[PDB]
Structures are given as structure tokens and as C-alpha cells.
Amino acid sequence: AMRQCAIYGKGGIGKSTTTQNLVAALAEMGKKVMIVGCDPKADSTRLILHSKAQNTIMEMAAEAGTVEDLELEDVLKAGYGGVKCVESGGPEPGVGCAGRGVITAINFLEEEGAYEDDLDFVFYDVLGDVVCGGFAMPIRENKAQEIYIVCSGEMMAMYAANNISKGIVKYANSGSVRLGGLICNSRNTDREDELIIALANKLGTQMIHFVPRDNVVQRAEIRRMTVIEYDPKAKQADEYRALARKVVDNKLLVIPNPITMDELEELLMEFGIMEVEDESIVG
Amino acid sequence: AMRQCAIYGKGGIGKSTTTQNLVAALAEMGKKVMIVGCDPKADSTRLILHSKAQNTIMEMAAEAGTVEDLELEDVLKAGYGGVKCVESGGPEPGVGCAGRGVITAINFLEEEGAYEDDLDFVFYDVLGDVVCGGFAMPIRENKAQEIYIVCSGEMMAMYAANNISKGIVKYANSGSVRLGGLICNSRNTDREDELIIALANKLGTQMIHFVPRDNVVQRAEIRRMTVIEYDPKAKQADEYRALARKVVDNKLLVIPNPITMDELEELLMEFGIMEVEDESIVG
Numbered sequence: 343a344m345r346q347c348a349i350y351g352k353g354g355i356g357k358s359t360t361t362q363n364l365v366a367a368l369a370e371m372g373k374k375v376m377i378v379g380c381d382p383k384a385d386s387t388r389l390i391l392h393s394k395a396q397n398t399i400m401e402m403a404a405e406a407g408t409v410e411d412l413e414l415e416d417v418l419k420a421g422y423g424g425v426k427c428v429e430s431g432g433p434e435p436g437v438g439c440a441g442r443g444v445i446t447a448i449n450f451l452e453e454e455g456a457y458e459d460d461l462d463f464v465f466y467d468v469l470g471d472v473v474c475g476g477f478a479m480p481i482r483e484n485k486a487q488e489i490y491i492v493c494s495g496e497m498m499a500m501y502a503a504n505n506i507s508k509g510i511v512k513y514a515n516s517g518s519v520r521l522g523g524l525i526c527n528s529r530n531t532d533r534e535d536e537l538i539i540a541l542a543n544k545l546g547t548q549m550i551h552f553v554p555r556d557n558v559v560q561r562a563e564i565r566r567m568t569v570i571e572y573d574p575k576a577k578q579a580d581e582y583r584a585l586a587r588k589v590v591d592n593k594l595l596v597i598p599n600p601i602t603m604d605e606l607e608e609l610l611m612e613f614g615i616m617e618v619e620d621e622s623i624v625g
Numbered sequence: 626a627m628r629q630c631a632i633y634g635k636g637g638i639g640k641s642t643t644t645q646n647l648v649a650a651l652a653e654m655g656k657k658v659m660i661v662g663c664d665p666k667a668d669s670t671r672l673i674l675h676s677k678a679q680n681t682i683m684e685m686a687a688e689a690g691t692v693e694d695l696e697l698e699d700v701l702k703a704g705y706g707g708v709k710c711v712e713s714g715g716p717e718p719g720v721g722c723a724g725r726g727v728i729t730a731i732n733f734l735e736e737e738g739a740y741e742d743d744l745d746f747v748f749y750d751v752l753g754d755v756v757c758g759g760f761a762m763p764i765r766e767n768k769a770q771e772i773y774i775v776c777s778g779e780m781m782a783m784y785a786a787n788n789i790s791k792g793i794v795k796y797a798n799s800g801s802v803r804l805g806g807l808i809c810n811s812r813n814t815d816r817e818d819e820l821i822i823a824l825a826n827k828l829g830t831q832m833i834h835f836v837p838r839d840n841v842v843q844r845a846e847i848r849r850m851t852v853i854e855y856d857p858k859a860k861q862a863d864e865y866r867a868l869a870r871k872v873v874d875n876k877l878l879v880i881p882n883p884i885t886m887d888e889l890e891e892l893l894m895e896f897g898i899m900e901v902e903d904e905s906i907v908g
């Protein structure tokens with residue numbers, strides 16, 4: 343058995359930091375994991391590979407001739423803890439469809455035997471600002487059974503969580519794609535944990551973890567590492583281990599109940615997210 | 626003559642707040658303006674209309690039968706300062722292409738005579754996390770000659786600015802689409818103004834204005850108003866008037882020079898954006 347998981351969320355919310363650190367914690371436990379980058383930014387594997395980024399399937403297929411000229415052992419690279427890494431890539435801005443590379447990448451990995459019996463987890467790191475084309479494919483074509491949405495007390499982050507949830511509902515007649523949880527990636531905003539717990543309850547899921555805002559992330563990433571590798575004794579390393587334990591143990595996988603913009607606005611007004619005038623901890 | 630402008634930028638960066646306040650300032654001067662919402666969130670006109678939002682062309686076409694059953698006087702509503710407002714809308718998450726509504730909306734407005742001789746400005750408020758489908762259309766089909774990109778010292782915001790700039794370059798053989806400027810929507814981060822000035826210089830443009838982070842925006846928006854209407858004597862009202870004056874007077878419209886991710890990373894490292902540990906003004 344393997345668990346196919348996808349990390350969705352708006353741009354800049356912390357999908358790649360969260361996914362690579364969660365996966366580093368799973369590898370540290372002895373789990374075998376593959377990360378599939380499904381974001382055109384294509385830096386979803388750099389902290390596992392100690393790299394600038396990784397050459398994408400779209401880029402390499404173009405150099406080799408066709409995608410059928412590529413070998414698995416060429417798009418798939420191992421880094422920290424033997425975690426296997428691949429990047430979809432996508433077309434340059436203003437050309438075709440930004441998500442087209444995800445379709446090509448996932449089909450290539452399936453055909454070429456990437457999904458080896460002894461993988462415990464696969465994580466897709468997926469752009470979530472639009473739910474269409476290749477970005478919808480993991481949900482529409484039943485590739486990721488467990489969706490975890492990284493969000494914050496930001497209206498845009500919660501709107502994106504609600505939109506991804508609407509996509510999961512749309513495809514619930516087919517396949518087994520479910521919402522597994524919200525991950526609150528802290529803005530250092532007051533009552534933000536309570537806000538995302540409230541949003542998770544309205545959607546019918548849970549807040550699986552509150553990830554603190556910790557500068558050790560910046561210090562680790564300047565050195566192209568996860569916090570797990572950079573400073574395994576950091577408080578933030580234990581935060582990612584807590585997230586990893588709760589993902590491993592999670593059994594709540596639901597068809598979510600998307601909410602209205604009225605409900606989103608009421609949540610923000612309720613937890614005083616818009617009336618606050620400073621961070622919880624200053625500094 | 627009329628100036629067709631588009632406001633691009635990543636999700637949550639401040640496109641709709643900035644556009645509606647800039648446009649309110651233009652109306653306050655005596656300019657005739659239309660806002661065209663090109664973001665599926667479809668709340669790009671609510672502060673002009675004193676409204677929850679506005680019913681979208683996609684929604685109304687479906688109720689009327691075809692888009693040819695709609696009349697202009699039905700998708701186009703006037704609010705503060707006689708500013709005319711329309712929302713494209715888009716398909717629900719997981720259905721078709723998130724940008725399809727923008728194509729339908731702009732073609733409808735052109736056919737039905739929305740672009741009246743005495744308009745001074747049109748502003749398209751465009752989702753910028755992906756540069757494809759309807760979101761690329763204002764650039765690909767030469768609808769918005771002046772692109773202004775709202776950004777911040779956030780890597781994701783600067784990456785999005787660079788991607789939009791790559792889209793403008795791609796279509797420079799045709800039409801007259803140009804980069805007009807960066808608008809820095811402040812995160813209250815130290816040396817952020819210097820960072821976006823540096824990015825603008827690398828791209829060959831300018832930072833047309835630094836918009837401060839001011840809670841008066843939240844107080845105005847809870848009352849469904851621009852700061853211009855809510856408190857015309859606010860410091861932030863004068864900030865939007867300054868932006869509006871510089872847009873009116875702007876003559877620098879360039880084919881930008883997109884930069885490498887190495888250059889983006891070097892900018893952030895140079896201005897100490899990643900090593901900072903608190904906001905410029907605490908509180």
C-alpha cells in the first residue's frame with residue numbers, strides 16, 4: 343500500500359516549505375517518499391536535493407526529443423533520507439496552459455513504474471490559485487486520495503481552501519479523492535489557529551497542524567535544506583515531526599462542505615483578524 | 626483617446642484594493658473610468674458599488690440564455706464618482722478553464738459599445754498567478770496597453786511580476802502591450818521600497834508608487850468603500866491620489882527585461898529581506 347497525498351494552497355502560502363519539511367520528517371522516521379512538483383515555480387524539491395532546483399520533465403523531454411526518450415532514472419533524483427524528487431515544469435508565461443506539464447509528468451511517472459510497491463507516500467505539491475487543467479488533474483483523475491490544504495488567516499488563503507474543496511466535491515461521484523485536513527502556516531496573527539480550526543469544522547475536516555512562523559526556515563533554506571536536516575534539534579523541526587505524525591495517523595478523509603463568501607467574511611470578523619493592529623509575538 | 630490599463634499580480638497582493646482606490650482617486654479628479662473584473666474571486670468592484678460584489682457576465686448569460694441576450698446596461702453598473710463596473714466571472718473550480726469568463730466578458734463589452742469615446746481610463750483587474758487562457762488575453766490580444774504589477778518584497782510576488790513581464794515580452798512582436806510600472810503594496814517590511822525600486826530597474830521599468838500598509842483600508846472595506854470615499858482626509862487617501870497622479874503622468878511604457886531566479890534571490894539577499902526579524906514600524 344502507498345498513500346497518495348497532495349498539498350494544495352494559494353501561491354506563497356508555504357506548500358513547498360511545508361511539504362519538503364513534512365517529507366524530511368517522514369524519511370527521518372524510516373518512510374520511503376516521492377515528491378512530485380506540480381507548480382510551474384519548479385523549486386518544490388530543492389531543499390531535499392540541496393540544489394538550486396531540479397530540471398523539469400517538460401525541459402528534459404524537449405532536449406531528448408519526446409517524453410518517451412526520457413528514462414525514470416533521469417527525471418527522478420534522490421536527496422535527503424533517500425526521498426525521490428521530480429518536477430513537472432510547465433510552459434513559459436503566455437504560452438498554452440500553465441498546468442499542461444503536470445498531466446505529462448504524472449502520466450510519465452505511472453507508465454515508467456515510478457510508483458514502486460515499497461513507496462509509503464507520494465506528495466504532489468500543487469499550485470492552488472486556479473483549479474483547472476493540470477492543477478485539477480490530481481483531483482479529477484483520482485491521483486491524490488488525501489488532499490491537505492496549506493492556508494492562513496488571510497481571506498485569499500481561505501478562499502483558495504474553499505475553491506480546492508469545491509473541486510473535491512465536483513469529482514466525488516468518481517474515484518476516492520477526499521479532503522484530509524487544513525495546515526495552518528502561521529502569519530504570526532492573533533487567534534489564527536482558532537480561525538483555521540473554525541474553517542476546518544465548517545468544511546467538515548480538521549486543522550491537522552498549526553505550523554509556527556520561525557526564521558530558522560529562512561536560515562535552513564538559504565543553505566538549501568529542510569529544517570529537519572539543517573537543525574534537527576530546532577523547535578520548528580519538532581513542529582514538522584508533529585505534522586508528520588498526525589498525517590501518518592490521520593483517518594479523517596471527507597467530502598467537504600464548501601462555504602459561502604458570507605461565511606468566510608463572518609469567520610474573519612468573528613476572530614477579529616481584520617481589527618488586530620500587531621503580530622501576537624512582536625519580533 | 627482612452628488609456629487601457631491592467632493591474633496584474635499574485636493572489637492577495639492588493640490588486641482590487643489598489644485598483645478601486647486608484648480609480649476612486651481618478652473619478653475624484655473628474656476622470657471617467659470603467660473597471661473590468663478579470664479575477665474569478667469577482668469582488669473587484671464591490672468598493673465602488675457599496676456592494677457584497679457584482680453578478681458576473683458568466684452568471685447572467687446563463688440566466689438570460691446566451692451572452693447575446695444580455696444588454697450592456699445590465700452587466701455594467703455605476704458606483705462612486707460614476708465609475709462603471711463589470712465582473713467577468715469564471716467556471717466553478719474543477720470545471721473547464723478558470724480564465725474562460727474573461728474572454729467572453731471583454732468580447733461582449735467591445736461588441737456592445739462599452740468603450741464609449743469619453744472614457745478616460747479602463748482598468749482590468751487580472752489574476753496573475755498563471756499567465757494563460759483568459760488571464761493572458763489582455764496581453765495576447767492587445768486589450769491593455771499599460772500593465773501595472775502590484776507586488777511586495779515577497780519572493781512569490783516578485784516571481785509573479787517577472788512571469789507577467791515574460792508574457793509581455795512574448796507578445797511584443799504584435800500589438801502595443803507594455804510594462805508601465807511596479808506598485809509596491811507594503812508588507813511593513815524594512816527596505817521593501819528599495820527592493821522593488823531595484824526589481825523595477827532590472828526589468829527596465831519604475832516603481833510608480835509605494836503604497837503603505839494602513840489599517841484604514843480594513844475599516845473602509847468593512848463598510849464596502851474605498852478609502853477615497855470612506856475618509857477622504859486619511860493619509861492613505863493622499864497615498865492613492867499620489868499613485869493616481871503618477872499613473873496619469875506616466876509616459877514610461879517598456880518591453881521589460883525579465884530576470885533569472887538567481888537575480889530574484891540576489892535582490893532578496895541584498896536588501897536583507899530574509900534576515901530581518903520584525904516589521905519596520907511595530908504596531
Ligand SMILES: Nc1ncnc2c1ncn2[C@@H]1O[C@H](COP(=O)(O)OP(=O)(O)O)[C@@H](O)[C@H]1O
Pocket residue numbers: 351352353354355356357358359360527528553554555556557559560563780781
Ligand atoms: N513556517 C514558516 N516559517 C517561516 N518562513 C516560512 C514558513 N513557511 C514558509 N515560509 C517561507 O515562505 C516563503 C514561501 O513558502 P513556499 O513554501 O515557497 O510557498 P509556496 O510553495 O506555497 O509558493 C518561503 O520564503 C518560505 O521559506
Ligand SMILES: Nc1ncnc2c1ncn2[C@@H]1O[C@H](COP(=O)(O)OP(=O)(O)O)[C@@H](O)[C@H]1O
Pocket residue numbers: 497498634635636637638639640641642643810811836837838839840842843846
Ligand atoms: N495597503 C493596504 N493596507 C492595508 N490592507 C491592505 C492594503 N492593500 C490591500 N489590503 C488588504 O489585503 C487584502 C487583499 O487585497 P486585495 O486587493 O483583495 O488582493 P487581490 O485583489 O490582489 O487578491 C484585503 O483584505 C485588503 O483590504
Ligand SMILES: [Mg+2]
Pocket residue numbers: 357358359381383385386467
Ligand atoms: Mg512552492
Ligand SMILES: [Mg+2]
Pocket residue numbers: 640641642664666668669750
Ligand atoms: Mg482581487
